[PDB]
């Protein structure tokens, strides 16, 4: 076998976490249930959508979600993508493992910043899969 669950969490569920969800589903889909959420939602960043479309991944149908404790409790791995999310993460259930893979916040920047972070996230997820 049954798939494990990975939960990407960030300050918002807008850019970094949405691109992580996009890459995660594509790369980890066979053995993982992939979800993402943020301390706040903010919607799917338009530039994040364009950045992923550029690499042939459609995240335009993703939802911008808040942290669901029901999913968190059932996660094998929680990955925090921003310092804000990591520092505000409470004591987790004993069965849950947590890793922090911080990435710069592309918000308010040019396409170029979304492209950089998009690819850094891609590399991180690919290497995770190849461990």
Ligand X SMILES: [O-][Cl+3]([O-])([O-])[O-]
Ligand Y SMILES: *Sc1ccc([N+](=O)[O-])c(C(=O)O)c1
Shortest distance, CB of residue 2 to ligand X, whole angstroms?
Answer: 27
Report helix, strand or coil for 48. helix
Say how far apart CA 25 and CA 78 lie, in whole Å. Answer: 15
Residue number of the CB atom closest to ligand Y: 89
The Cα-based distances of 115 to 21, 62, 83, 84, 98 in angstroms read: 15, 19, 20, 22, 26
Q: Does 67 bind ligand Y (CB under 6 A)?
A: yes
Interacting residues of 104 by C-beta distance below 8 A, sequence separation 6+: 113, 116, 117
Task: Tell me the per-residue interface mask from 54 to 93 with K ion, x by CB under 5 A, - otherwise.
Answer: -----------x----------------------------
Residue 105's binding partner among ligand Y, ligand X, K ion, none (Cβ under 5 to 8 angstroms by kind) is ligand X
Cβ closest to ligand X, residue 94 vs residue 108: 108
Look at residue 52 and give the partner it binds from K ion, ligand X, ligand Y, none, a contact being a CB closer than 5 to 8 Å depending on partner kind: none
Q: Which of 95, 44, 90 lies closest to 67, judged by CA?
A: 90
Interacting residue ranges for K ion, rule: CB under 5 A: 36, 65
Interacting residue ranges for ligand Y, rule: CB under 6 A: 9, 39, 67, 78, 80, 85, 88-90
């Amino acid at each position: 076998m049954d798939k494990k669950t990975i939960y990407f969490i960030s300050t918002g569920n807008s850019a970094r976490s949405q691109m992580a969800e996009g890459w995660g589903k594509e790369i980890l889909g066979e053995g993982w249930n992939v979800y993402s959420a943020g301390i706040e939602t903010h919607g799917v960043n338009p530039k994040a959508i364009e950045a992923m479309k550029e690499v042939d991944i459609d995240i335009s149908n993703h939802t911008s979600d808040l942290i669901d404790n029901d999913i968190l409790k059932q996660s094998d791995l929680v990955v925090t993508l921003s310092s804000d999310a990591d520092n505000n993460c409470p004591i987790l259930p004993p069965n849950v493992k947590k890793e922090h893979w911080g990435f710069d916040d592309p918000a308010g920047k040019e396409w170029s910043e979304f492209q950089r972070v998009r690819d850094e996230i891609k590399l991180a997820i690919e290497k995770f899969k190849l461990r």
